């Protein structure tokens, strides 16, 4: 992993001295050299995974040797799991309010049911007459939910299909929008992305998102190697951070998702704001991946 990959060379005078050099940033000349020397280190071009032990340090260590952009790199992405992501699609192929059945499947699973209840009881907690919940603690609650609950319950519930609006709202209600997603204001998506960029886990999992969810044209489904789950996994990873996406409405099948933001006040940057926001709502990858998965593909 990235943490050990640093330790493999951190004892060396080369990595030790040049690591500190980049931390400083003439210095720019030495920092450029520090990149080239560290470029050969096991840390450089390392990879982490969602739910990793010390998932934060595996990125703080790696990012600390970045020399210093709209689409960031995805070193956090468990690249090798991309195959497993395909396998998960094979699983859901085998295994009416369908989101309810997904919820019932969780309720019968001692681990999922316990984790699911253990985090809903946080996100539904009333704080004051004019404060529905502690959204930060809810985000932390959900952030653990989507790593500790098995994929065959996490993704089945998150990307469940529906036949009516009662189910479709249940789908929207999966992570309590009234706590985790909705708020009094919708900040500018560009500023919101800028805030997310400063957090290692949010920024990197955001990188994971468009790493697998970018509205690509070369592939058939706009997903890498037409991989539905690769996007869906990286997408789910974003839930529990400032950029938490959610379903827009309760359409029985018209599945549209986006974070809790808009593009008001972008002006000269309206294109860049939409350029990223479109990846949530106008993205055939998420559209096909969520529907195909929910339909058993």
């Amino acid at each position: 992993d990235c943490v050990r990959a640093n330790e493999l060379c951190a004892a060396e005078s080369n990595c030790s001295s040049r690591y500190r050099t980049l931390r400083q940033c003439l210095a720019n000349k030495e920092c450029q050299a520090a990149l080239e020397v560290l470029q050969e280190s096991p840390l450089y071009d390392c990879r982490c995974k969602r739910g990793m032990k010390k998932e934060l340090q595996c990125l703080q260590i790696y990012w600390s040797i970045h020399l210093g952009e709209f689409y960031e790199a995805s070193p956090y992405e468990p690249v090798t799991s991309r195959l497993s992501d395909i396998f998960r699609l094979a699983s859901i192929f085998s295994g009416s309010n369908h989101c309810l059945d997904a919820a019932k499947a969780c309720n019968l699973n001692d681990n999922c049911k316990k984790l699911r209840s253990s985090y809903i009881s946080i996100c539904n907690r009333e704080i004051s007459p004019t404060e529905r919940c502690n959204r930060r603690k809810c985000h932390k609650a959900l952030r653990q939910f989507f790593d500790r609950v098995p994929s065959e319950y996490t993704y089945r519930m998150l990307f469940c299909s529906c036949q009516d609006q009662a189910c479709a709202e249940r789908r929207r209600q999966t992570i309590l929008p009234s706590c985790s997603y909705e708020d009094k204001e919708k900040p500018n998506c560009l500023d919101l992305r800028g805030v997310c960029r400063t957090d290692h886990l949010c920024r990197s999992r955001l990188a994971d998102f468009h790493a697998n969810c970018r509205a690509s044209y070369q592939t058939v489904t706009s997903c890498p190697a037409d991989n539905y789950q690769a996007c869906l996994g990286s997408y789910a990873g974003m839930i529990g951070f400032d950029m938490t996406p959610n379903y827009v409405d309760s359409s029985p099948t018209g599945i549209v998702v986006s974070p809790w933001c808009s593009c008001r006040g972008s002006g000269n940057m309206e294109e860049e704001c939409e350029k990223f926001l479109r990846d949530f709502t106008e993205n055939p990858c998420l559209r096909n991946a969520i529907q195909a998965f929910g339909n058993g593909t």
Partner: protein
């Protein structure tokens, strides 16, 4: 005998079917403590039986045999009801079972 031992049981029941006033179509694994007590009646219980049957003790709300009752419940279960709201319920599903 054919009676089963005292232990944990289970039945999948919808929240609304439990009759708790919560209009929800989610199911929970409703576990409960039931069955024949393997432990012999305590010497206390034997005295209670003999002293009760012979009307030596005050007539009172007594129990002359170990009760196959739970000793612990599951932490909680949460659900989404018909009103697009979530609720958690504690002490609903047995976690430990023993005769007292």
């Amino acid at each position: 005998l054919g009676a089963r031992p005292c232990g944990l049981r289970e039945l999948e029941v919808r929240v609304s079917e439990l009759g708790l006033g919560y209009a929800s179509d989610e199911t929970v694994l409703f576990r409960y403590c039931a069955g024949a007590c393997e432990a012999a009646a305590r010497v206390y219980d034997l005295g209670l039986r003999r002293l009760r049957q012979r009307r030596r003790l005050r007539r009172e709300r007594v129990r002359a045999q170990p009760c196959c009752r739970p000793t612990a419940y599951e932490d909680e279960v949460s659900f989404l009801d018909a009103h697009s709201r979530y609720h958690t319920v504690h002490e609903l599903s047995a976690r430990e079972c023993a005769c007292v």
